[PDB]
Motif scaffolding. Structure first.
Motif, short mmCIF file in Angstrom:
data_model
loop_
_atom_site.label_atom_id
_atom_site.label_comp_id
_atom_site.label_asym_id
_atom_site.label_seq_id
_atom_site.Cartn_x
_atom_site.Cartn_y
_atom_site.Cartn_z
N UNK A 133 4.62 -13.81 9.18
CA UNK A 133 4.43 -12.37 9.37
C UNK A 133 3.30 -11.96 8.48
N UNK A 134 2.08 -12.01 9.02
CA UNK A 134 0.91 -11.64 8.25
C UNK A 134 1.10 -10.23 7.69
N UNK A 135 0.76 -10.07 6.41
CA UNK A 135 0.85 -8.79 5.70
C UNK A 135 -0.45 -7.97 5.83
N UNK A 136 -0.31 -6.65 5.96
CA UNK A 136 -1.44 -5.73 6.01
C UNK A 136 -1.64 -5.01 4.68
N UNK A 137 -2.74 -4.27 4.61
CA UNK A 137 -3.01 -3.37 3.51
C UNK A 137 -3.38 -1.98 4.02
N UNK A 138 -3.13 -1.00 3.19
CA UNK A 138 -3.61 0.33 3.47
C UNK A 138 -5.14 0.37 3.30
N UNK A 139 -5.79 1.19 4.05
CA UNK A 139 -7.25 1.24 3.96
C UNK A 139 -7.77 1.87 2.68
N UNK A 140 -7.55 1.29 1.50
CA UNK A 140 -7.91 1.96 0.25
C UNK A 140 -9.20 1.43 -0.37
N UNK A 141 -9.77 0.41 0.23
CA UNK A 141 -11.20 0.15 0.21
C UNK A 141 -11.63 -0.05 1.65
N UNK A 142 -12.93 -0.05 1.92
CA UNK A 142 -13.39 -0.37 3.28
C UNK A 142 -12.91 -1.72 3.78
N UNK A 143 -12.80 -2.71 2.91
CA UNK A 143 -12.44 -4.06 3.34
C UNK A 143 -10.94 -4.24 3.48
N UNK A 144 -10.14 -3.53 2.68
CA UNK A 144 -8.69 -3.64 2.84
C UNK A 144 -8.22 -3.07 4.18
N UNK A 145 -9.06 -2.27 4.85
CA UNK A 145 -8.72 -1.76 6.18
C UNK A 145 -8.19 -2.84 7.09
N UNK A 146 -8.84 -3.98 7.10
CA UNK A 146 -8.53 -4.97 8.11
C UNK A 146 -7.99 -6.25 7.55
N UNK A 147 -8.23 -6.51 6.26
CA UNK A 147 -7.69 -7.67 5.57
C UNK A 147 -6.21 -7.85 5.89
N UNK A 148 -5.85 -9.06 6.30
CA UNK A 148 -4.47 -9.47 6.35
C UNK A 148 -4.35 -10.78 5.56
#
Ligand SMILES: CC(C)C[C@@H]1CCO[C@@H]2[C@H](CN[C@@H]2C(=O)N[C@H]2[C@H]3O[C@H](OCC/C=C\[C@H]2C)[C@H](O)[C@@H](O)[C@H]3O)C1
Ligand SMILES: [Mg+2]
Ligand SMILES: [Mg+2]
Ligand SMILES: [Mg+2]
Ligand SMILES: [Mg+2]
Ligand SMILES: [Mg+2]
Ligand SMILES: [Mg+2]
Ligand SMILES: [Mg+2]
Ligand SMILES: [Mg+2]
Ligand SMILES: [Mg+2]
Ligand SMILES: [Mg+2]
Ligand SMILES: [Mg+2]
Ligand SMILES: [Mg+2]
Ligand SMILES: [Mg+2]
Ligand SMILES: [Mg+2]
Ligand SMILES: [Mg+2]
Ligand SMILES: [Mg+2]
Ligand SMILES: [Mg+2]
Ligand SMILES: [Mg+2]
Ligand SMILES: [Mg+2]
Ligand SMILES: [Mg+2]
Ligand SMILES: [Mg+2]
Ligand SMILES: [Mg+2]
Ligand SMILES: [Mg+2]
Ligand SMILES: [Mg+2]
Ligand SMILES: [Mg+2]
Ligand SMILES: [Mg+2]
Ligand SMILES: [Mg+2]
Ligand SMILES: [Mg+2]
Ligand SMILES: [Mg+2]
Ligand SMILES: [Mg+2]
Ligand SMILES: [Mg+2]
Ligand SMILES: [Mg+2]
Ligand SMILES: [Mg+2]
Ligand SMILES: [Mg+2]
Ligand SMILES: [Mg+2]
Ligand SMILES: [Mg+2]
Ligand SMILES: [Mg+2]
Ligand SMILES: [Mg+2]
Ligand SMILES: [Mg+2]
Ligand SMILES: [Mg+2]
Ligand SMILES: [Mg+2]
Ligand SMILES: [Mg+2]
Ligand SMILES: [Mg+2]
Ligand SMILES: [Mg+2]
Ligand SMILES: [Mg+2]
Ligand SMILES: [Mg+2]
Ligand SMILES: [Mg+2]
Ligand SMILES: [Mg+2]
Ligand SMILES: [Mg+2]
Ligand SMILES: [Mg+2]
Ligand SMILES: [Mg+2]
Ligand SMILES: [Mg+2]
Ligand SMILES: [Mg+2]
Ligand SMILES: [Mg+2]
Ligand SMILES: [Mg+2]
Ligand SMILES: [Mg+2]
Ligand SMILES: [Mg+2]
Ligand SMILES: [Mg+2]
Ligand SMILES: [Mg+2]
Ligand SMILES: [Mg+2]
Ligand SMILES: [Mg+2]
Ligand SMILES: [Mg+2]
Ligand SMILES: [Mg+2]
Ligand SMILES: [Mg+2]
Ligand SMILES: [Mg+2]
Ligand SMILES: [Mg+2]
Ligand SMILES: [Mg+2]
Ligand SMILES: [Mg+2]
Ligand SMILES: [Mg+2]
Ligand SMILES: [Mg+2]
Ligand SMILES: [Mg+2]
Ligand SMILES: [Mg+2]
Ligand SMILES: [Mg+2]
Ligand SMILES: [Mg+2]
Ligand SMILES: [Mg+2]
Ligand SMILES: [Mg+2]
Ligand SMILES: [Mg+2]
Ligand SMILES: [Mg+2]
Ligand SMILES: [Mg+2]
Ligand SMILES: [Mg+2]
Ligand SMILES: [Mg+2]
Ligand SMILES: [Mg+2]
Ligand SMILES: [Mg+2]
Ligand SMILES: [Mg+2]
Ligand SMILES: [Mg+2]
Ligand SMILES: [Mg+2]
Ligand SMILES: [Mg+2]
Ligand SMILES: [Mg+2]
Ligand SMILES: [Mg+2]
Ligand SMILES: [Mg+2]
Ligand SMILES: [Mg+2]
Ligand SMILES: [Mg+2]
Ligand SMILES: [Mg+2]
Ligand SMILES: [Mg+2]
Ligand SMILES: [Mg+2]
Ligand SMILES: [Mg+2]
Ligand SMILES: [Mg+2]
Ligand SMILES: [Mg+2]
Ligand SMILES: [Mg+2]
Ligand SMILES: [Mg+2]
Ligand SMILES: [Mg+2]
Ligand SMILES: [Mg+2]
Ligand SMILES: [Mg+2]
Ligand SMILES: [Mg+2]
Ligand SMILES: [Mg+2]
Ligand SMILES: [Mg+2]
Ligand SMILES: [Mg+2]
Ligand SMILES: [Mg+2]
Ligand SMILES: [Mg+2]
Ligand SMILES: [Mg+2]
Ligand SMILES: [Mg+2]
Ligand SMILES: [Mg+2]
Ligand SMILES: [Mg+2]
Ligand SMILES: [Mg+2]
Ligand SMILES: [Mg+2]
Ligand SMILES: [Mg+2]
Ligand SMILES: [Mg+2]
Ligand SMILES: [Mg+2]
Ligand SMILES: [Mg+2]
Ligand SMILES: [Mg+2]
Ligand SMILES: [Mg+2]
Ligand SMILES: [Mg+2]
Ligand SMILES: [Mg+2]
Ligand SMILES: [Mg+2]
Ligand SMILES: [Mg+2]
Ligand SMILES: [Mg+2]
Ligand SMILES: [Mg+2]
Ligand SMILES: [Mg+2]
Ligand SMILES: [Mg+2]
Ligand SMILES: [Mg+2]
Ligand SMILES: [Mg+2]
Ligand SMILES: [Mg+2]
Ligand SMILES: [Mg+2]
Ligand SMILES: [Mg+2]
Ligand SMILES: [Mg+2]
Ligand SMILES: [Mg+2]
Ligand SMILES: [Mg+2]
Ligand SMILES: [Mg+2]
Ligand SMILES: [Mg+2]
Ligand SMILES: [Mg+2]
Ligand SMILES: [Mg+2]
Ligand SMILES: [Mg+2]
Ligand SMILES: [Mg+2]
Ligand SMILES: [Mg+2]
Ligand SMILES: [Mg+2]
Ligand SMILES: [Mg+2]
Ligand SMILES: [Mg+2]
Ligand SMILES: [Mg+2]
Ligand SMILES: [Mg+2]
Ligand SMILES: [Mg+2]
Ligand SMILES: [Mg+2]
Ligand SMILES: [Mg+2]
Ligand SMILES: [Mg+2]
Ligand SMILES: [Mg+2]
Ligand SMILES: [Mg+2]
Ligand SMILES: [Mg+2]
Ligand SMILES: [Mg+2]
Ligand SMILES: [Mg+2]
Ligand SMILES: [Mg+2]
Ligand SMILES: [Mg+2]
Ligand SMILES: [Mg+2]
Ligand SMILES: [Mg+2]
Ligand SMILES: [Mg+2]
Ligand SMILES: [Mg+2]
Ligand SMILES: [Mg+2]
Ligand SMILES: [Mg+2]
Ligand SMILES: [Mg+2]
Ligand SMILES: [Mg+2]
Ligand SMILES: [Mg+2]
Ligand SMILES: [Mg+2]
Ligand SMILES: [Mg+2]
Ligand SMILES: [Mg+2]
Ligand SMILES: [Mg+2]
Ligand SMILES: [Mg+2]
Ligand SMILES: [Mg+2]
Ligand SMILES: [Mg+2]
Ligand SMILES: [Mg+2]
Ligand SMILES: [Mg+2]
Ligand SMILES: [Mg+2]
Ligand SMILES: [Mg+2]
Ligand SMILES: [Mg+2]
Ligand SMILES: [Mg+2]
Ligand SMILES: [Mg+2]
Ligand SMILES: [Mg+2]
Ligand SMILES: [Mg+2]
Ligand SMILES: [Mg+2]
Ligand SMILES: [Mg+2]
Ligand SMILES: [Mg+2]
Ligand SMILES: [Mg+2]
Ligand SMILES: [Mg+2]
Ligand SMILES: [Mg+2]
Ligand SMILES: [Mg+2]
Ligand SMILES: [Mg+2]
Ligand SMILES: [Mg+2]
Ligand SMILES: [Mg+2]
Ligand SMILES: [Mg+2]
Ligand SMILES: [Mg+2]
Ligand SMILES: [Mg+2]
Ligand SMILES: [Mg+2]
Ligand SMILES: [Mg+2]
Ligand SMILES: [Mg+2]
Ligand SMILES: [Mg+2]
Ligand SMILES: [Mg+2]
Ligand SMILES: [Mg+2]
Ligand SMILES: [Mg+2]
Ligand SMILES: [Mg+2]
Ligand SMILES: [Mg+2]
Ligand SMILES: [Mg+2]
Ligand SMILES: [Mg+2]
Ligand SMILES: [Mg+2]
Ligand SMILES: [Mg+2]
Ligand SMILES: [Mg+2]
Ligand SMILES: [Mg+2]
Ligand SMILES: [Mg+2]
Ligand SMILES: [Mg+2]
Ligand SMILES: [Mg+2]
Ligand SMILES: [Mg+2]
Ligand SMILES: [Mg+2]
Ligand SMILES: [Mg+2]
Ligand SMILES: [Mg+2]
Ligand SMILES: [Mg+2]
Ligand SMILES: [Mg+2]
Ligand SMILES: [Mg+2]
Ligand SMILES: [Mg+2]
Ligand SMILES: [Mg+2]
Ligand SMILES: [Mg+2]
Ligand SMILES: [Mg+2]
Ligand SMILES: [Mg+2]
Ligand SMILES: [Mg+2]
Ligand SMILES: [Mg+2]
Ligand SMILES: [Mg+2]
Ligand SMILES: [Mg+2]
Ligand SMILES: [Mg+2]
Ligand SMILES: [Mg+2]
Ligand SMILES: [Mg+2]
Ligand SMILES: [Mg+2]
Ligand SMILES: [Mg+2]
Ligand SMILES: [Mg+2]
Ligand SMILES: [Mg+2]
Ligand SMILES: [Mg+2]
Ligand SMILES: [Mg+2]
Ligand SMILES: [Mg+2]
Ligand SMILES: [Mg+2]
Ligand SMILES: [Mg+2]
Ligand SMILES: [Mg+2]
Ligand SMILES: [Mg+2]
Ligand SMILES: [Mg+2]
Ligand SMILES: [Mg+2]
Ligand SMILES: [Mg+2]
Ligand SMILES: [Mg+2]
Ligand SMILES: [Mg+2]
Ligand SMILES: [Mg+2]
Ligand SMILES: [Mg+2]
Ligand SMILES: [Mg+2]
Lengths: 275, 48
Positions: free
Chosen positions: A1-16
């Motif tokens: 179950x890939x984990x997401x991040x909140x968009x709190x930098x531009x790159x964390x938007x899509x990082x899993x």
RNA sequence: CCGAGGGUAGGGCCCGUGACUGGGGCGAAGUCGUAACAAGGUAGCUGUACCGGAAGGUGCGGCUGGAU
RNA sequence: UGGGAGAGGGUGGUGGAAUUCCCGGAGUAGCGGUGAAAUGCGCAGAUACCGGGAGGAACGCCGAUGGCGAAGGCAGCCACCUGGUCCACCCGUGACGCUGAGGCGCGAAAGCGUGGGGAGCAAACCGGAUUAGAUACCCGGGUAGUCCACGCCCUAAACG
RNA sequence: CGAUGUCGGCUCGUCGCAUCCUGGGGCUGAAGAAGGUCCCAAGGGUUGGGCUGUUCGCCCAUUAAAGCGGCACGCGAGCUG
RNA sequence: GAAUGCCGGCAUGAGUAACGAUAAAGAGGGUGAGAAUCCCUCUCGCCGUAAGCCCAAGGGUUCCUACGCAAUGGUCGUCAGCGUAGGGUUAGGCGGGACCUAAGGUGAAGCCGAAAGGCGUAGCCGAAGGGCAGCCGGUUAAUAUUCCGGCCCUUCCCGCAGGUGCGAUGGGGGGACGCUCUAGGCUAGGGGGACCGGAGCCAUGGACGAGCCCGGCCAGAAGCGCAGGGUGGGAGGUAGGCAAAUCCGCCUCCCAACAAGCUCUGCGUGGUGGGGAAGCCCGGGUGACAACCCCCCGAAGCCAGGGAGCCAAGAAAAGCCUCUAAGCACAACCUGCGGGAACCCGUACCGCAAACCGACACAGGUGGGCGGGUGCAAGAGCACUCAGGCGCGCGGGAGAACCCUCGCCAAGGAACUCUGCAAGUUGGCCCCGUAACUUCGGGAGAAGGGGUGCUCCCUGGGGUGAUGAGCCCCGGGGAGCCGCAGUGAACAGGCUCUGGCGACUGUUUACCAAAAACACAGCUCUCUGCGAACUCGUAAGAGGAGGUAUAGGGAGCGACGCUUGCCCGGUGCCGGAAGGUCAAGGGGAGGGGUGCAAGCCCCGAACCGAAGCCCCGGUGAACGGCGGCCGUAACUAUAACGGUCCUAAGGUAGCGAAAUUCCUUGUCGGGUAAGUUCCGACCUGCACGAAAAGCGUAACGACCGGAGCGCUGUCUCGGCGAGGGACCCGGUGAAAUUGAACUGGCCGUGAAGAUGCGGCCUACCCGUGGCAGGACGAAAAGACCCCGUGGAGCUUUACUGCAGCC
RNA sequence: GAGCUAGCCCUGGCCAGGGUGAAGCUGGGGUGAGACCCAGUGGAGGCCCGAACCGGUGGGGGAUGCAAACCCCUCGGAUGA
């Protein structure tokens, strides 16, 4: 179950990132690691022979047991499941009743605390290894040897498997991860089940620095270069390919088959991959 | 700004030194020419 | 001190108007085809989707408010 | 409390018919298709026939004017988990009921996201006919999709 | 062509007159006022702005007028660029 | 006599520019032939996260002392990193070696290559990584963890005693590891003291004071104390750790478990040994029996191999410990003690610089550690200052233009200009407050405001201590005082609106481009079944990868959203056991030369005979391509509609005068007084258009447009002022250039632009400061343009080969 | 010839101070259970501001230079590709 991040930098938007739930142990087995000698992509000449390599995180190699017919009959317990950075699959720490310790790549569904075993007589249970002839047609199977006693070669990365299709004499017929049908010799060993960490394919790198951590250096398009560099190089302004699209060394790169014509293994390929 | 000569005794001796020269057909022709020419120094002196 | 109000700055609702644009209504005798009403000449309708000058056509599924 | 019927629902399993494709064999001049045809396929050996294999999807007969569900909807067969419901006995609570703006859940098909899957079917699209035209109806192809998981969409002649 | 730096601007002028204004005149289809047209005249003057790199041109607000040309399309060992 | 000839010499430019950071000087006294420049003293200024101090590199005597001043030093020179000479560098513990391994290199075995050589497991080499025993003070003109003093320690050898199955290059453990965050307790370092020690001081109005000023420690073995780290003990089984094993691993039982014990570090203490100021006196001496104490702050360092979280998953080998094998157990190893032994190399000095890299005593470049105090919210920022170091190796005047760097400016305020270029403005902190839009994070420091010093009084909480005092840290309320002004100096955003491009942070043309370019996550096509494909290599061998289709190569596209249409005739690639063509080779009909002949020798048809090509299909996120004329509606106009020619198919959605629109400043609207730019529209798109992606898009940008507010010396339009130069005087003294020169203006002439010719005009001789019109001024054998059967890079369906592949 | 520069490999080192405040966790609320919401804790990030350090945006100066690329002002990154 890939984990997401909140968009709190531009790159964390899509990082899993992988969830690492199946991991039960976070440092490797000291007797099973050795230094993984980074190449940069350079060969013994010093020449780059694979472009755009280098700069990754330091890693230790974990010796994996790809034979497993080494210890026919001796059961082992699944002590731990561990992160291996040299491969997509997770890996399983095994304590033989021998006292010997060994790593295997971790099949899907494998549980810490269970026993696995290897041999012609082993149970058909996720994690066991038997020559291919003794595994029932229809069994999904991974870490398949390709020629007997040569080592597991096929279906090793996260999520993959081969399916056993049928038998023909000394050979069984496997449907590989790629979709090809192939005769593989029946004395070739294989491990019951599919490789685990199937969610691997859905990780989203998210930012350029991430590829850097993996030792992937930026890839430059040929269209971005000059004619001294590349078929696609040059042109005032942007430019279409203007010729059949090509590699840096000039060979066509949309469609052109490259398997060798007169290769002895052709007799054992039943049907090329599809899709 | 940073210029091109950045002396380094180890670098000097390992690159141009007597033993490097002798290890190689070309470096040996260097020693042989500078001998035939009568050079007072066949190789750069570094303190080591 | 508070204080009519004046000033600065920034929001909220409303009204009027605006190159151009969207469809809507209306209009005795315009141009194109004929989708619907008969089995309307491919039963019709239908939510949706996609396509087509136009009505519409087709897919999927639904209704009979369908004929024989 | 004792019983009942049922495609009610969910998970896993699994069985035969059929289509397609692939392999083997046998065989030859057409097959397909239509109102009629053409496109299409076929001597590079098709169609029709036999054996083997692969795979997806749907479950014939039973089957009904039938049954179940609150609706949408539910049909091979098996096991498990589970809802609703009816009957009998007249045993227990003692009006504890009805409805219900909001709220919450469910909600054919189509559609959308991310993976998978893809035999048949088929919007779009291409071609062949028809026609004044034919962006149709008929014929040959054909991609989404139709299937599975998870998550959205929340519409309907969601009708008695 | 063993280099005569090139458009526009800025700065600094200086010259011609085929004169834009100012002075003097004749003719007028010159009543007056104001124009038109030609002659003499280069002494002086000939604005600020919006657009564009622009010269030019158009526009705004004025003016007695908002002249046209030459000087290596004046002027880069003076600046800009 | 010429070759921008060559070598050397010597002129000219010229007593000209310059004399290398605008941190800055003045005087007295000495020395000496000679002094702005050397020495000394006093005054002044500059650095002080350095412009101070300690390491490393690099340099290599430059170090210290005497004697010198020709040259070197941008001037001077008595001085010096200069000349001559003499002296100076001292280690078992510091660093390197007699230790280890890393990349890499080298390489028994082995592999490959015409030669030369290329590889290559082990092993060996290889360090700023691991490992390992020395701290404090004193001494010299010059070295010191090195000498000396005090107190500690290491190894090797040999002996004595006690102990034990001793024993290894072999087995095992350990060594042994990331990033961010971080607990307790200490130390370094710092602040304060009304306490302790000190030479003294009372000035100029006041102070003999709880006054000023100075200082108040450093090292230390065992032992002890505080704080941390590391570690379960026992037994039975055992087939694994390439022999063995009592070790290790694995199973089991029992006991111990936030401990404890054992062990090891750090810190405190500690016998003892040192140090010890201001001031005064001539580096020294006194001070001084110096004092050596309390409180507070407090690390990024120490305890350390500590803890937590996270994903990108984080060296080796030795030292050491344990196990045993040969062996040997008269040995050997372990512990204690004693005596003896302990080598080689470096050590001077400079080290952000006048000693290193930059030709120079060159405003440039150079890695690690220490880097005090006060205030400013913090800090390594800023200002001032400590210790310490400097005033930058030409000076003295003058007070022109002009230039540089700087300050201010009436009224106006962008009118400047290609452009607000530049410079203003703004500027820290606390508080109030903050829009469209948004991917819900953001946009945001949005915008815009208010506060800010000092004094007295009242009061809240934390740290240390004790719960208190004291010291320290965060506040809260009330009342006041002063000034033009309270981040009173210094350091410290101008803002908004709206387009284009690119998602974003990143990257780039070292030295004219930082961007819209490259990269980027992400998307798609495609190759690849593993001795992979692909790449480098003649090869061996490597990379790919100790990976295995959820992976690896190649290609285009470039977050995300919504999407991505029609054409497969040509080229490409993919599929196709038929057919056609097709080389060597097969075949040998049939000829030929020669020989008396057997024969020898040559030519040779049909036919069989690969890949490739032809041929039949597929294929677009493969290369690519996506029409013309004429007619037509009850006003006109325009054409939903039709006709016909052509195509492989005739450009779909979406966008459009555009980073693309030629005509063009298209046209209409907005904004302006006025708008070739801008924004919004229209569409006859010269010449958009869908992964050389199409259209949008919150955030982002030293990108490129347009507007507005704020504010300004940008400007109307300039003025004044500062300093560094320019100028004058003393010192030192270049340069490119230069046919020679006794080198004026006009109008003509002339190879067509004349100081040099003709005619006229003008003009006494020679400078200095200035300006640049001319000397078609200098510089550079035009880089544009052409020419040369000149060169080079690049392309391709130019030719011809080659590698590679079939 | 890679003592300059470009990439890579091994082994070390360095990044003052301040700001924002993700996940998770604790509790509260919520529900059949849930999602979810609130508060506290927490300390993420090619996050923000800004030295050292790395840069080199605009202007000015320099232009027989202090310098064959420097100086002044300004400006970009500054836990990361
Ligand atoms: C249409 C035009 C192309 C006509 C064209 C204009 C260009 O030049 C001119 C050519 C005619 N000759 C001019 C020329 O060569 N001029 C050169 C200058 O070079 C240096 O000045 C700065 C460089 C500028 C120009 C270069 C080329 C140098 O200092 C000057 O002395 C001078 O040599 C015509
Ligand atoms: Mg995410
Ligand atoms: Mg979110
Ligand atoms: Mg996992
Ligand atoms: Mg190891
Ligand atoms: Mg390798
Ligand atoms: Mg090697
Ligand atoms: Mg390389
Ligand atoms: Mg490569
Ligand atoms: Mg590489
Ligand atoms: Mg992998
Ligand atoms: Mg893994
Ligand atoms: Mg096989
Ligand atoms: Mg992926
Ligand atoms: Mg990595
Ligand atoms: Mg990528
Ligand atoms: Mg790229
Ligand atoms: Mg290019
Ligand atoms: Mg390019
Ligand atoms: Mg090249
Ligand atoms: Mg080439
Ligand atoms: Mg090429
Ligand atoms: Mg090209
Ligand atoms: Mg190009
Ligand atoms: Mg182009
Ligand atoms: Mg290009
Ligand atoms: Mg092309
Ligand atoms: Mg090509
Ligand atoms: Mg295949
Ligand atoms: Mg450099
Ligand atoms: Mg260097
Ligand atoms: Mg060295
Ligand atoms: Mg070195
Ligand atoms: Mg070196
Ligand atoms: Mg070498
Ligand atoms: Mg050498
Ligand atoms: Mg040789
Ligand atoms: Mg030789
Ligand atoms: Mg000699
Ligand atoms: Mg030599
Ligand atoms: Mg009033
Ligand atoms: Mg109909
Ligand atoms: Mg009809
Ligand atoms: Mg009909
Ligand atoms: Mg009909
Ligand atoms: Mg249709
Ligand atoms: Mg046929
Ligand atoms: Mg045939
Ligand atoms: Mg299939
Ligand atoms: Mg009852
Ligand atoms: Mg639904
Ligand atoms: Mg559906
Ligand atoms: Mg057709
Ligand atoms: Mg017809
Ligand atoms: Mg399909
Ligand atoms: Mg119904
Ligand atoms: Mg010329
Ligand atoms: Mg010349
Ligand atoms: Mg010229
Ligand atoms: Mg010249
Ligand atoms: Mg001007
Ligand atoms: Mg005049
Ligand atoms: Mg005039
Ligand atoms: Mg103009
Ligand atoms: Mg002109
Ligand atoms: Mg014009
Ligand atoms: Mg007038
Ligand atoms: Mg003119
Ligand atoms: Mg002209
Ligand atoms: Mg002209
Ligand atoms: Mg001119
Ligand atoms: Mg002119
Ligand atoms: Mg000019
Ligand atoms: Mg110029
Ligand atoms: Mg000019
Ligand atoms: Mg000139
Ligand atoms: Mg001039
Ligand atoms: Mg000139
Ligand atoms: Mg001559
Ligand atoms: Mg010369
Ligand atoms: Mg010559
Ligand atoms: Mg010469
Ligand atoms: Mg001579
Ligand atoms: Mg000479
Ligand atoms: Mg001379
Ligand atoms: Mg001279
Ligand atoms: Mg002279
Ligand atoms: Mg003079
Ligand atoms: Mg002169
Ligand atoms: Mg000069
Ligand atoms: Mg100078
Ligand atoms: Mg300075
Ligand atoms: Mg200055
Ligand atoms: Mg003096
Ligand atoms: Mg002197
Ligand atoms: Mg003197
Ligand atoms: Mg001086
Ligand atoms: Mg002195
Ligand atoms: Mg004095
Ligand atoms: Mg300080
Ligand atoms: Mg030297
Ligand atoms: Mg001298
Ligand atoms: Mg000298
Ligand atoms: Mg000098
Ligand atoms: Mg003397
Ligand atoms: Mg000495
Ligand atoms: Mg010693
Ligand atoms: Mg020895
Ligand atoms: Mg070694
Ligand atoms: Mg070595
Ligand atoms: Mg070594
Ligand atoms: Mg070492
Ligand atoms: Mg040592
Ligand atoms: Mg010691
Ligand atoms: Mg013992
Ligand atoms: Mg470890
Ligand atoms: Mg390790
Ligand atoms: Mg390490
Ligand atoms: Mg990390
Ligand atoms: Mg702490
Ligand atoms: Mg201490
Ligand atoms: Mg302090
Ligand atoms: Mg055993
Ligand atoms: Mg005494
Ligand atoms: Mg630190
Ligand atoms: Mg530590
Ligand atoms: Mg190693
Ligand atoms: Mg024995
Ligand atoms: Mg014995
Ligand atoms: Mg020795
Ligand atoms: Mg020394
Ligand atoms: Mg420096
Ligand atoms: Mg330093
Ligand atoms: Mg020095
Ligand atoms: Mg100097
Ligand atoms: Mg210097
Ligand atoms: Mg201090
Ligand atoms: Mg501050
Ligand atoms: Mg000075
Ligand atoms: Mg200085
Ligand atoms: Mg000086
Ligand atoms: Mg003067
Ligand atoms: Mg001022
Ligand atoms: Mg004033
Ligand atoms: Mg003013
Ligand atoms: Mg204004
Ligand atoms: Mg104003
Ligand atoms: Mg303006
Ligand atoms: Mg500009
Ligand atoms: Mg400020
Ligand atoms: Mg707004
Ligand atoms: Mg808002
Ligand atoms: Mg806005
Ligand atoms: Mg917006
Ligand atoms: Mg928001
Ligand atoms: Mg504010
Ligand atoms: Mg705020
Ligand atoms: Mg206040
Ligand atoms: Mg005050
Ligand atoms: Mg700021
Ligand atoms: Mg960008
Ligand atoms: Mg860009
Ligand atoms: Mg874009
Ligand atoms: Mg974007
Ligand atoms: Mg960044
Ligand atoms: Mg550049
Ligand atoms: Mg360049
Ligand atoms: Mg360059
Ligand atoms: Mg530049
Ligand atoms: Mg550029
Ligand atoms: Mg930039
Ligand atoms: Mg680029
Ligand atoms: Mg991008
Ligand atoms: Mg994408
Ligand atoms: Mg894909
Ligand atoms: Mg190659
Ligand atoms: Mg060869
Ligand atoms: Mg490997
Ligand atoms: Mg790839
Ligand atoms: Mg992008
Ligand atoms: Mg790109
Ligand atoms: Mg959107
Ligand atoms: Mg085509
Ligand atoms: Mg085709
Ligand atoms: Mg084709
Ligand atoms: Mg062939
Ligand atoms: Mg083309
Ligand atoms: Mg074409
Ligand atoms: Mg009519
Ligand atoms: Mg479309
Ligand atoms: Mg347009
Ligand atoms: Mg556009
Ligand atoms: Mg265009
Ligand atoms: Mg235009
Ligand atoms: Mg134009
Ligand atoms: Mg216009
Ligand atoms: Mg307007
Ligand atoms: Mg138009
Ligand atoms: Mg293209
Ligand atoms: Mg393009
Ligand atoms: Mg756009
Ligand atoms: Mg945008
Ligand atoms: Mg945007
Ligand atoms: Mg940017
Ligand atoms: Mg930028
Ligand atoms: Mg603008
Ligand atoms: Mg001015
Ligand atoms: Mg002055
Ligand atoms: Mg004088
Ligand atoms: Mg003189
Ligand atoms: Mg001199
Ligand atoms: Mg002469
Ligand atoms: Mg003469
Ligand atoms: Mg003269
Ligand atoms: Mg004259
Ligand atoms: Mg002429
Ligand atoms: Mg003349
Ligand atoms: Mg003359
Ligand atoms: Mg003459
Ligand atoms: Mg004459
Ligand atoms: Mg004559
Ligand atoms: Mg004459
Ligand atoms: Mg004359
Ligand atoms: Mg005259
Ligand atoms: Mg003079
Ligand atoms: Mg002069
Ligand atoms: Mg001149
Ligand atoms: Mg001239
Ligand atoms: Mg000339
Ligand atoms: Mg000239
Ligand atoms: Mg030149
Ligand atoms: Mg030449
Ligand atoms: Mg020439
Ligand atoms: Mg030239
Ligand atoms: Mg050029
Ligand atoms: Mg020419
Ligand atoms: Mg020719
Ligand atoms: Mg010729
Ligand atoms: Mg040629
Ligand atoms: Mg060539
Ligand atoms: Mg060849
Ligand atoms: Mg190839
Ligand atoms: Mg940092
Ligand atoms: Mg803040
Ligand atoms: Mg918080
Ligand atoms: Mg937590
Ligand atoms: Mg950042
Ligand atoms: Mg901030
Ligand atoms: Mg730089
Ligand atoms: Mg500026
Ligand atoms: Mg320069
Ligand atoms: Mg600078
Ligand atoms: Mg600055
Ligand atoms: Mg920053
Ligand atoms: Mg920072």
């Amino acid at each position: 179950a890939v984990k997401k991040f909140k968009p709190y930098t531009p790159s964390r938007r899509f990082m899993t990132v992988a969830d690492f739930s199946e991991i039960t142990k976070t440092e490797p087995e000291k007797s099973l690691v050795k230094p993984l000698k980074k190449t940069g992509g350079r060969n013994n000449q010093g020449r780059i022979t694979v472009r755009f390599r280098g700069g990754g995180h330091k890693r230790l190699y974990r010796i994996i047991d790809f034979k497993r017919w080494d210890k026919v009959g001796i059961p082992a317990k699944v002590a731990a499941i561990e992160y291996d950075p040299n491969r997509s699959a997770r890996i399983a720490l095994l304590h033989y009743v021998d006292g010997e310790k060994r790593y295997i790549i971790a099949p899907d569904g494998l549980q810490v605390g269970q026993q696995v075993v290897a041999g012609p007589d082993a149970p058909i249970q996720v994690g066991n290894a038997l020559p291919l002839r003794f595994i029932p047609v229809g069994t999904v199977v991974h870490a398949v040897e390709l020629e007997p006693k040569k080592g597991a070669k096929l279906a090793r990365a996260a999520g993959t498997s081969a399916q056993i299709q049928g038998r023909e004499g000394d050979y069984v017929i496997l449907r590989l991860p790629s979709g090809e049908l192939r005769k593989v010799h029946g004395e070739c060993y294989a491990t019951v089940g599919a490789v685990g960490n199937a969610d691997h394919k859905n990780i989203v790198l998210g930012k350029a620095g991430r590829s850097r951590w993996l030792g992937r250096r930026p890839h430059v398009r040929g269209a971005a270069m000059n004619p001294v560099d590349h078929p696609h190089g040059g042109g005032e302004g942007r430019a279409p390919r203007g010729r059949p699209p090509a590699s840096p060394w000039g060979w066509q790169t949309k469609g052109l088959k490259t398997r060798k014509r007169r290769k002895p293994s052709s007799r054992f390929i039943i049907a090329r991959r599809k899709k | 700004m940073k210029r091109t000569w950045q002396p380094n005794r180890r670098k000097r001796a390992k690159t141009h030194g007597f033993r490097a020269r002798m290890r190689t057909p070309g470096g040996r022709k260097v020693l042989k020419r500078r001998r035939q020419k009568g050079r007072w120094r066949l190789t750069p002196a570094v303190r080591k």
